[PDB]
Structures are given as structure tokens and as C-alpha cells.
Structure 1
Amino acid sequence: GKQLTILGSTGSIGCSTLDVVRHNPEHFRVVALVAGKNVTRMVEQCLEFSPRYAVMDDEASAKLLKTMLQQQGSRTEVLSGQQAACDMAALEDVDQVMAAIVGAAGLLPTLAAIRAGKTILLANKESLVTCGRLFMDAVKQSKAQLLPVDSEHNAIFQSLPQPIQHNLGYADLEQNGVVSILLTGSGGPFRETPLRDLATMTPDQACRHPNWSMGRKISVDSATMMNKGLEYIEARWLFNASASQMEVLIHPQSVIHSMVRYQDGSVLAQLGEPDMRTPIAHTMAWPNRVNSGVKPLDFCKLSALTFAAPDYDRYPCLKLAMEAFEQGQAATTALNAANEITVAAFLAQQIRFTDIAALNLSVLEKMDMREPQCVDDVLSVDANAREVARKEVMRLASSA
């Protein structure tokens, strides 16, 4: 029975990983659940999995759950604050920690797990996008095992040889016969759209997606391919890949989740349904397998699988992400931050769809790059890029 702490349990990934536990009760034991304010969900999960501890980052939210679970006859101890969240990730008896908390938060909670040398089911982008170098140095030193939950990175992991999986980010690709990592993406809803028309696309149009049913922020990132840009930054740190060892491909049907090109010409790939329980269950059971409740892929009910090379004129955000990587963590962190601001501004109809790539670029052009030396430095670059971006949005919505 693997002991696990779930960081961000009430979210989509959180509830999904919990469903995998349901399907395999004798395989996993929930030791701790961590969340933000969604007391309701927390209550249900605690009542179902009898966690030893439960924490909410919000003091108030924590008080309600504190008593709500008291009366419910629950014997789970309720705590609160980041400090507590971080302790849950470092519990002596916990084997794995699902790091599903997003944004700047979750950075310290995930780092806490890495420093405790635990197995980390990496389900957040912030870690590698903003602290790529710092986190990979920490995992190497603390000997923690990273197991990527993100569909693409997970497909890549499953398609890699054992020696790289066990020394992720440290092992050399070439020495292990890998020539490159093939990062795949759908290309979004504007894959065919004339370039001239991108500037007038609306939020509803941008958030139009077939495959995965993600939120609006991620749907837009998929339309600009900033999402793939961020996964590119992540992949290089995670798999120890140079620019020439990375290949980005458009695969509209999203059946293949990503692949790995080898020395003898072999290309290994992972295919599946657009259901996160698969990659989640894979990381949870690794190196073994477990039922995830996901229905088997029916090859007789598929659209023809196609591929294409992305055009940077169409996806400038993709190229921006690639360039930001060469500039360091300050750059990628700033790009990520600006993008959060611009996508939100676009969604609020304050700027055009094409203003996202334009403002993201402009923010990076004005930032004073100073490579962070710890997460606190990273957080400062984030806050600073976030402010620079808000002003560009206001400057654009006002007069400029």
C-alpha cells in the first residue's frame, strides 16, 4: 500500500487521482489532502478516504472544515496555511505526493516534497516553467523521483528507456540511444484560419476545443500554442534535452500524446483517450500498472491521424517560449506570468487574440533579466512581470 499526500485534492486532477484510488483501495492509502477554499469537496473526500490530515490554505476555509468534519464524526485533523501544506508533502511515512496545486502557490509545497526525497507525481507546470533549473538541481541532490502527470510529458516518459526514467533530467539522451523528444499538440481551433483573421477571433472562438475539456485559460493557451511552448520549456529541463533534441509536431486528433525518436530509427509513442486518469494511474502504479476506469481506445472509431510542422507566424507564442528558454529562468518565468495576464485580458475582451503574443513579447523585452537563485527570487520575477504586463494591457485598452 503506497502512502500518498494529495496537493490540490479538490481540483480536477485531484478528484481524478482520487478516482484511481477508489478503483484500487488495497493499493493506495490517502494520508493527507491539501486544498484552497473548496471546503465542500474536501469534506466529501475526507469522509470517504479517512485521511490522517487535511489542510486548507485559507484560514477561514480551514475553520469551517475544522468543525464541519468534527460534527460529521470525522477524525481527520484539520490544519491551515502554506507551512502546513509543505509539511504534508514532507510527511515521513508518505511515499508519493500528487503535486496538483497550480501557480506560484504549490511551488514551495512541491519543493518540500523534492527535498524530502519523495516520489513526485508532477501535475503542475509552474515548477519546471519557472524553476526548471532550481527544481532539477534539487531533485538530483535529494534523489527524488519525478513522474510527470501531464499527458505529453507522461507519454514521453512511458516512451523512454528505463535508465532515463530512473535518472530523469540527469541521464544523457544520446548515450541512451535517444535522438529526440517529439512533443505533440492539437494546434488549436485556428489551425486552418487565415493569418489575417486571427486578430479578430473572439474568446468563445478561442476556447472552442474537441479533445480535452479544459478551462478557458488553457484552451486559449492551446490556440496560441503557448501551452506547447510551456511544455517545451518543461521537457528540456525534465528530460535533459538540447534544442536539437526537441521536435514540436501538430497532431490534430490528439490520439498520440507524444513520442521519442531513437537511434535505430524506432519511434516509440503512447496513445490513449483524453482522460487524465490514465497518466495519473501510470505514475501512481509505476513501474507497474493499475486499472484507472478509463475505457480502452477503440482504433476502429478514430479520425485519420495526421501531423504537421507548426508555423511560427501562426503560433508566435510557441517560438517565444523557445527563445525564452535560452534566456534563462527569469525569461521563462516572466513569459509565463505575462501570459497569465494577457490571456485573462483577452478573455475579458480588453485586447485582441493577437495582442497576447504581442504583449507577451513586449513584457519580455522590458524585463531586466537576473537569474533567480531560489523560489523567492522566482516569485519576485513573477510579480514584476505580472505588473509590467498589466500596464501594457491598460496602456493598450486606454489610448495606445
Structure 2
Amino acid sequence: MKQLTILGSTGSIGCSTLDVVRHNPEHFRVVALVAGKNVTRMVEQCLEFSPRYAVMDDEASAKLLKTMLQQQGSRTEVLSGQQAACDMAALEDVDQVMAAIVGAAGLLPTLAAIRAGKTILLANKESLVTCGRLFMDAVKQSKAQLLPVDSEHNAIFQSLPQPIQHNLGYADLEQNGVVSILLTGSGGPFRETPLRDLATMTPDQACRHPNWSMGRKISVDSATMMNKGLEYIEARWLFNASASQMEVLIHPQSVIHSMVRYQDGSVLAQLGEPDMRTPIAHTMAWPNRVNSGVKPLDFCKLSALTFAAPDYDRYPCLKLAMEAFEQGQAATTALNAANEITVAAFLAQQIRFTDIAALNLSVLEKMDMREPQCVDDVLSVDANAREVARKEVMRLAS
């Protein structure tokens, strides 16, 4: 029996995680739930799973949650704020922490779980992207184990040998017969959209992913392929891969979730339904398996599986992420921050869909900070880039 804290319980990943728990009450128990502002969902989750604690980051949301749960006779203690989220991630009683807060806001609570030596079920890719080597070193220095939840990285993990799996981030790919890591793939909802129509796409259009039901931020990132850029960076840290050991491949059906090339010509892959309960359950049970609620993939009802080279002209954000990573951590931290601001602006109908990539570039051109030496420096670059991004958004205020 393993006890769990879920960071970001009310969102897409959080709810999928709770469904895996629902299917396996003998194996998993929720001790703490952490979220932002969705009180309605958090009340529902607390009444079902009777967590010891529930945390809302937003102070006013926490007040409402405390009152509502008290009237319902809940035993759950309600806390509030960022520090309480960190406290939950570090509960001495907890074995696993689902890191599923969106954006760099998840970094401090995720780092707290790492310092406490927990098993980190890493969905929140922005935390690793923005923190980089400092993140990976903290996992090694403490007793922590990273298990990749993100679909592609989970697929790659499943398709790697045990010496790599058991020394994630530091083992040598070539010594284990790996030639490269093949990161797929979808292209998003606008893959075939005429280029001239991109400027007038709405938030609802951008968030209708053809294959995955996800949160709004990552759905927009999938439409620009900034998501694939962030995942490229994530893969390089997780699997200790160089630029020459990474391939990006478009696969519009999202059945093959990613692959690994070996020296003898073999390519190992993970396939399945586009359902995050599968990778979540992989990480929660590893090295064993559990029922996730996902049924067997029916190969007789599939679309034909196709592949293609990335259309870099169409998706400037992909190349931007790759070049930021080349430049260094300051540029990468700045780019992630800029993208959080521009995506949020687009969702709030302040800028156009095509302004995301342009404003992201504009922020990078205006920033030239030194490489972070500690987590405080990562946060300074992040904060600075957010401010630059807010000013660029306001310049396009209609």
C-alpha cells in the first residue's frame, strides 16, 4: 500500500490519477490533494477520497473549501498557499507525489518532494524545462526517483533497458546500445489548416486536440508545437541525450507514443489508446502493472498509421525551443516563462494565436541574463521574463 500526494488534483492529469486510484484502492491511498482555485471539483474529490489534507493555493478558494467541507462533516484539514503545497509534497508518510501542477508554479512543491526523497511522478514538464541540471542534480543528491508520466517520455522509458531506467538522467545511452530517441508526433489541430487562417483561430479551436483531452495550456502548446519543444528539452535531461541522439517525428494518429532506436536496427515502441491513465498507472505501479481503466487498444479499428518530417516553417515555436536550449538555461527559463504569459494572453483573447510565437521570440531578443547558479536564480530569470512578456502583450492591446 502506497500513500500519495497529488499536486494539481483538480486538473486533467489530477483527475486521471484519481481514476487510477479508484481502480486500485488496495494499492493506493490519497493523503493530500493540492489545487489552485477549482473549489467545486476539490470538494467532490475530498468527499470521495477522504484525504488527510487539501490545499488551495488561492487563499479565498481555501476559505470556501474549509467552510463547505466542515458543513459536510469531512475530516479533511484545509490549508492554503504555496508553502502548504510544499509541506504536502514532503509529508513523511507519503511515498509518491504526482507532480501535475501546470507551469513553473509547480517547481517549488516538486522540489520539496525531491528533497524529501519521494518518488516523483513527473507530469509537470515546465518544472524540469525551467530548472534543468539543477532539477536533475537535486534528484541525485536526495534519495528521489523520477518516473516520467508525460506520454512520450513514459513510452521512451518503457522502451529503454533497465540500466537506463534505474539511473535516469545519468546513464550512458551508447553503452546500452541506444542510437537515438524518437519523439512523436501529432502536429495539433491546425496541422492541415491553411497558413493564412492561423491568425484568426480562437482559443476553443486551438484547444480541441484531435487525439488527447487535456488542460487548456498544453492544448495550446500542442497547437503551436511548443509542447513538442518543451518535450524535446525534457527528453534530453531525463534520458541524457545529445542533440544527435534526438529525432522529432510527426505521427498524426498519436497511437505510437514514442520510440527508441538500437544499434542492431531494432526500434522499440509503446503504443496504446490516447489516455493518460495508462502512463500514470505505469509510473504508480512500476516495476509492476495495474489496471488503469483503459481497455485493450483495438488494432482493427485504427486509422492507418503515418509519419512525416516536422514542418518547422509552420511551427516556429519548435525551433525556438531547440535554439533556446542550445543557448543555455537562462534562455530556456525565459522562453518557458514568456510562453506561459503569451498562451494565457491568447486564451483571454488579448492576442492572436500567431502572436504566441512572435511575442515569445520578442522576449528572448530582449533578455540576456547569466546562467542560473541556484533555484533562486531560476526564479529571478523566470520573473524577469514574465514582466518583459506582460509588456509585449500590452503593446498589442486592442
When normalised by structure 2's length, the TM-score is 0.94
Measured at CA, do residues 84 and 307 of structure 1 come closer, stay the same or move farther in structure 2, by a change above 3 Å?
same
Cα pair 2:103 2:340 within 8 Å, conserved: no
1:331 Cα deviation (Å)? 0.9
Q: How big is the shift at 1:95?
A: 0.8
Q: CA deviation at 1:65?
A: 2.5
Moved more, 213-222 or 16-25: 213-222
Q: How many angstroms does 1:10 deviate by?
A: 1.6
SS in 1 for 2:104: coil
> How many residues are treated as equivalent by the alignment?
397
| C-alpha distance 363-31 of structure 1, shift in aligned 2 (>3 A) | same
After TM superposition, the runs of 4+ consecutive aligned structure 1 residues lying more than 6 A away are none
* Structure 1 pair 36–348 and aligned structure 2 pair: CA distance change class (3 A): closer
1:387 counterpart residue number: 387
Residues 3-24 of structure 1 deviation map (CA, whole Å, 9 limit, x = unaligned): 1111111222111111111111
For 1:195-252, what per-residue CA distance to the aligned partner results, in whole angstroms no more than 9, with x for missing partners? 4554455545444432112244333322221110011111111111110111000000
Once the two structures are TM-superposed, the CA of residue 286 in structure 1 deviates from its matched residue by: 0.6
Shift in Å, 1:83: 1.6
CA distance in 1, matches of 2:50, 2:245: 45
**Cα distance change, pair 66–215 in 1 and its aligned pair in 2 (3 A):** closer
SS at match of 1:102: coil
Greater CA drift, 196-205 or 221-230 = 196-205
Structure 1 spans left out of the alignment, 5+ residues = none
Asked whether the 8 Å contact 1:140–1:170 carries over to 2, the reply is: no
For residues 191 and 60 of structure 1, do their structure 2 counterparts lie closer, same or farther at Cα, with a shift above 3 Å needed? closer
Partner secondary structure for residue 105 of structure 1: helix
Cα distance between partner residues in 2 of 1:353 and 1:38: 26
**Aligned-pair distance for 1:375?**
2.8
Once structures 1 and 2 are overlaid, which stretch shifts more, 280-289 or 28-37?
28-37
Partner SS, residue 247 of structure 2? strand
Q: Does 1:333 align with 2:333?
A: yes
Asked whether 1:11 is paired with 2:3, we answer no
The answer as to 2:81 corresponding to 1:81 is yes
* Contact map agreement 1:46 1:54 (CA 8 A) in 2: yes
Q: CA 1:265–1:300 in 2, change beyond 3 Å: closer, same or farther?
A: same
Aligned to 2:168: 168
Contact 1:187 1:225 in 2 (8 A): yes
Q: Which runs of 5+ in 2 are unaligned?
A: none
Instruction: Pick closer, same or farther for the CA change 1:6–1:177 going to 2, 3 Å.
Output: same
Q: How far did residue 130 of structure 1 move?
A: 0.4
- CA displacement, residues 294-332 of structure 1 (integer Å, 9 cap, x when unaligned): 121100001100001112212221111011111222111
Gap change, CA 1:197 and 1:52, over 3 Å in 2: closer
Which digits, 9 at most, give the CA deviation of each residue in 1:68-108, with x for residues without a partner?
A: 32332222222222222111111112110111112232211
For the Cα contact (< 8 Å) 2:188–2:210, is it kept in 1? no
Q: 1:58 to 1:342 in 2, by over 3 A?
A: closer
Q: Which sits farther off after the overlay, 347-356 or 41-50?
A: 347-356
Q: How do 1:115-264 residues align onto structure 2 when only pairs under 5 Å count?
A: 115-195=115-195, 198-199=198-199, 201-264=201-264
How far apart are the structure 2 equivalents of 1:23 and 1:47? 17
Stretch deviating more after TM superposition (277-286 or 347-356): 347-356
Paired position in structure 2 for 1:106:
106
SS in 2 for 1:282: helix
The offset of 1:349, in angstroms, is 4.7
Conserved? CA contact 1:334–1:364, under 8 Å = yes
Structure 1 SS opposite 2:396: helix
Partner Cα separation in structure 1 for residue 149 and residue 44 of structure 2? 24
* Residues 102 and 126, structure 1, Cα contact 8 Å, conserved in 2: yes
Q: TM-score, normalised by structure 1?
A: 0.93
Q: Judging changes above 3 Å, is the alpha-carbon distance between structure 1 residues 46 and 396 closer, same or farther for their aligned structure 2 residues?
A: closer
**Distance change >3 Å, CA 46–CA 348, structure 1 → 2:** closer
1:307-322 to 2 correspondences below 5 Å: 307-322=307-322
Structure 1: distance between partners of 2:87 and 2:317: 37
With 243-252 and 121-130 compared, the bigger mean Cα shift is at: 121-130
What SS class does the counterpart of residue 294 from structure 1 fall into?
A: coil
Question: How far off its partner does 1:282 sit?
Answer: 0.8
- Partner Cα distance (1:216, 1:109) in 2: 22
Residues 54 and 206 of structure 1, relative CA distance in 2, 3 Å threshold: closer
Deviations 1:164-205 (A, max 9, x none): 111110111111111111110211233234545544555454
What do residues 116-145 of structure 1 show as CA deviations (whole Å, max 9, x unaligned)?
Answer: 111000111221110111110101111311
Question: C-alpha separation between the residues in 1 aligned to 2:189 and 2:40?
Answer: 35
- The answer (yes or no) to whether the contact 2:56–2:80 under 8 Å persists in 1 is yes
Shift of 1:62: 2.3
Return the alpha-carbon distance in structure 2 between the equivalents of residues 43 and 208 of structure 1.
Answer: 27
Q: Distance in 1 between matches of 2:177 and 2:382?
A: 37
**Distance of aligned partners of 1:152 and 1:93 in 2 relative to their CA distance in 1, 3 Å threshold:** same
Task: Give me the whole-angstrom Cα distance separating, in 2, the residues matched to 1:237 and 1:47.
Answer: 38
In terms of mean alpha carbon deviation, does 276-285 or 43-52 score higher? 43-52
Assess, with a 3 A threshold, how the Cα gap between structure 1 residues 71 and 148 changes in structure 2: closer, same or farther: same
Q: Distance in 1 between matches of 2:349 and 2:49?
A: 42
Most deviating of 113-122 and 26-35: 26-35
Secondary structure in structure 2 of the residue aligned to 1:121: strand
CA distance in 2, matches of 1:379, 1:79: 24
1:208/1:28 CA distance change after superposition, 3 Å:
closer
Taking structure 1 as reference, are residues 322 and 31 closer, same or farther at Cα in structure 2, changes over 3 Å only?
A: same
- 8 Å CA contact retained: 2:5, 2:97: yes
1:237-283 C-alpha deviation (Å, 9 max, x unpaired): 11111101110000001111111111111111111111111111111
